[model samples]
Target chain A: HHHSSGENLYFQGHMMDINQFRRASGINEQLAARWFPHITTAMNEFGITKPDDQAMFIAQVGHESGGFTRLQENFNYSVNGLSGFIRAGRITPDQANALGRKTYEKSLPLERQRAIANLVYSKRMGNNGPGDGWNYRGRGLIQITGLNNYRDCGNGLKVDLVAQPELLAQDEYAARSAAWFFSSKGCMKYTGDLVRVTQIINGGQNGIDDRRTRYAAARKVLA
Target chain B: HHHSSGENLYFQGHMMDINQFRRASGINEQLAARWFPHITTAMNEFGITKPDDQAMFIAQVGHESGGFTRLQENFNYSVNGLSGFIRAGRITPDQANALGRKTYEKSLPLERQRAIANLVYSKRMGNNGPGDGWNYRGRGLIQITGLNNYRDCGNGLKVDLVAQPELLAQDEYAARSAAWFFSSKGCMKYTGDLVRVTQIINGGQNGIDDRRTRYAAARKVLA
Candidate 1:
């Protein structure tokens, strides 16, 4: 059937209000739903869709993004730390390494003091808080992490990726990135079912612990 | 009498809230009844007091932050962009310049592109529209505008002071910086009281169009 059609999937009061989906996706439903049709059009695109596959996909995504509720709200996603849609899926190793240091590095002589004073006194220069000093590393409903993923997964799909990758801190971009990963060809196999997908990605006790909670939710929605 | 306890101002709802002060800054019986007790004891810290001075302060702050309501919801103010409050009392050139760039520097290339993108993809970044863009230029009652303001104004205030000044895009730090600017003792003179001791920092505007709406609302509520 048409999976993107906003069908009879009622879960909680927040069924397919489409608006809610658009809100969650950070992309208008019309724009985001564009890919949904393509994904469901043919099983050959990603292969067959089964309960376990869908289950894993849902669960993994749930764990990644605080259950699709919270996304990054910082502005580090865009150019000059402004672009809102720049997702973490666009970050890289060099970028990540630089950020990790820039945030925590705190010792130097007086000359450096003036140069670094702006950073020290400024609000979000490092891992000081939620948005990772405004670098936009992990965010949205999929918890896409780090700068490397920005280049790899973002490019793997069709999204234009920037080097900073910190833009993912903005929830708007993170949502779109999450959509990209969920529907991308590479992701389908690992998450044939949301259940297994979540298990493998989380790869630890946390996944096993939360697996049941996710399955129960997705199952009831699907049914 | 005292500013805090005796003033009894409210910004949001509930118990004498600062948010109420953020919205409206009218001195009235309700305000006196609610907050009059603390006067200089606690309320002075927020700079609220008798009718005229409080009204002027509220008006100034309204002009600076488009009223505290707008400032509070400013995700970008503390996030990674140049939008912020713009009051005149303590506004420095640096603040004005940065805000000028952030608010209007759209086609300027390097800084401009990010500005546009931030506005375009602003939904996930704040409480406003997906890209509705608060675009509040050094908004609120005080209108602390740019990075240089932090340098110029901050330096005078005895704080560490920011150097690059661009770091104002670091989120709440920017807002706090702007707030501190308005709160400075130097600003106390130009605060528009009959004393005229406050410096009229608005340059030529003479702080005319700087009224905050919410502050007006509260005045109406009290009246």
Candidate 2:
């Protein structure tokens, strides 16, 4: 589901190719293409403004979905802990952690990454899985993380989030959920703040301890 | 790929019962919905007037796609061989057999499900993969089987039948291809006939040999 257009985003003097974006953020070209459209569409609809805001949107997703390098790789939709099995069917909101905490730690960059890693990772694993009886891990397209998030996302789509929340595995549901995740916290407003991003991605006030180093890296990328 | 409405159809006795349908078809509810919308819409646009004609429209899809059960089954758009691969991206015509013929054969009933098996079990396996791909095997909804049939289905859709014919996997492309398949070989008249009906399942010409027996089973529930 990689988008045809994003691969060619024109930014600054350099042509921000989708492949580079994917490498910097960690996603595949195909997943990147499929994901960008829905995210952009949702951002526009959600009243997100400013080019920096848009840039941050992409950056965060890149940060999240192993930079879009890996998505639903298993065909069952479990990648980087974003399996779409949240609160629906067989997966209750409590049993998603069957895979253990390290499974959720793949994409984190800091100790703060670990904590944020644990919680969001737990969220994905917290439930038995997304949707009822659909025992697939909730991977890919933004690492749908955990159960509460799954319930929230399932609720937003107005689908039988409890029974068929697995629809998130499809392009439609996956894209929209990614959109919702992007706009939350400072992920949308502080596009240039990587330290802040670590905090948000970690979902903690002080998710990153080595803020200075992370910020330095962020500054280099932003510059 | 589970079909919500198809579940209802299975329950209401419009065709086979749930377990038998599940046993016979690899496609799930969601996929059923995805493919069906394409079929019905295509028939309507092309002036496929007879109910039987519409039936053929639906029947052939079943002929391919393991009747609803392929595990990693997806439609590739950019195939290499005669009509190209299915769904339009990954598989070439010859690549079909490599993906697992036994898995594909699992969806069909014992009698008529021999296409994948015959090819897989025989000496011709080398030549029988994807390019020779035709009706029910071509790609997308109709799966127009052989290289020759590829030309027919491609021409009917007014595309380059010789190259990248996998576009037929797209609904827009698939609909026209299906229309041509129905009209050709007088399958249009037998649209509702058991043989034609079976075509909708795997794009085959024979009606399972036990046509009357199977038809009786289907009719008792449907009629």
Candidate 3:
């Protein structure tokens, strides 16, 4: 069954209206309308049929990517921030301390942070080499961060994300990547528990209340 | 004129209602009802008199404290997560790297995270001595963190927050602290812009869409 050719699945009264999307996401009509086709197709492809599922999907992506804005990961960490990776254990303490002790004393420039991102992200999620971490650092809706994530989502979408990660920046790829991540991550099970779902998607309870708030608003429209 | 015994200054209608709070926050009715009086009183004390102000107040607090449910800050960070603090310049790289990289290779234990929280939070916000970080680690509706904030709020409310920071967990204190933070931070200046207000309160645009969502809901009733 062709998911994109079916009856209009993106709307049901207030459940998933474009106007509601515009309001909930702070996106203008032009962009909401522009992205509507991709969102619908990508969602349907993943069997995200129920209102709960759809609402959760929209809210999650909306929250993560700032309503279809901010596709690339922000890498503007200061020299002090470079050490955070060390403190977090993503990098060795030696690497951290080697960077420096004083504020702006040691350096982990964006290029180095990307390099470190690769080192930390290596040996996981099918990422084998040195550049994989920087290449796969958080792109698209829902932010597929890490080499394995890119591999998995890219494979599912028939896209070579590792070779050209920027493709995920496109509208269709961003929508589909989120859906792929959602289904693969088994997010459907937590549709009822929006907070848990946020944890599942966000790797922590960051902005959970806001996620819940968006879920409620989306549910109202989608329902 | 006394604010509480008047024309329902705290709520316009559905904006700050218990049911609305439950829906927006996904908390149960019991807690919502339990927190209602405190929310009302707290808003009044800080001159959060308008519906816009009240809605913003409730929405921000609800988002921060998980609908008046969690009284303490979440400290689930790994050694890597600890590094995130350094990355954000919250702590110096030296302190993080100096801490053993093991015994918590994968994560920063709650105790350790608290210790780090204390160190990171030290030297400011009235935190003068040792153990002040854990003592002042975020509590109450606004998630008031740091020793200085506790001291200021405590003095204003005639409470000894420095000696007993746990007092912020109480319903009355939680609500009042949020209101106090809002006014002290001059949040009213951004009442018309939910995104800006979230930035002002959350230190960034974290969960901005959800904040906007709650504000929209609150505006509907309050407006």
Q: Once model 3 is optimally superposed onto the true structure by TM-score, how far is the C-alpha of residue B114 displaced, in angstroms?
A: 3.7
Clashes of each: 90, 107, 20
List the DockQ of the predictions in order.
Answer: 0.01, 0.02, 0.01
Instruction: Order the candidates by TM-score, highest first.
Output: 3, 2, 1
lDDT tens digits by residue: candidate 1, A91-191: 34443333332434453333333222233223432334333322434455566544456656568544454455654554334544654666563556654
TM-score of each: 0.28, 0.31, 0.43
Interface RMSD, every prediction, one decimal place:
26.4, 18.2, 22.3
Error of 2 at B125 (Å): 47
- Sort order, lDDT high to low: 3, 2, 1
lDDT of 3 by residue, A85-201 (tens): 666667775554443334643544666566566766777666777777677777787777776667556555555676777777777788877876776556776767887788789
Q: Which regions of candidate 2 deviate over 4 angstroms? A: A1-32, A72-136, A189-191, A204-223, B1-223
Candidate 3 wrongly placed segments (more than 4 Å): A1-223, B1-17, B20-26, B90-111
Please rank every candidate by DockQ, starting with the best: 2, 1, 3
The TM-scores of chain A alone, one per candidate, are 0.44, 0.49, 0.76
CA-only RMSD, every prediction: 20.6, 24.5, 24.7
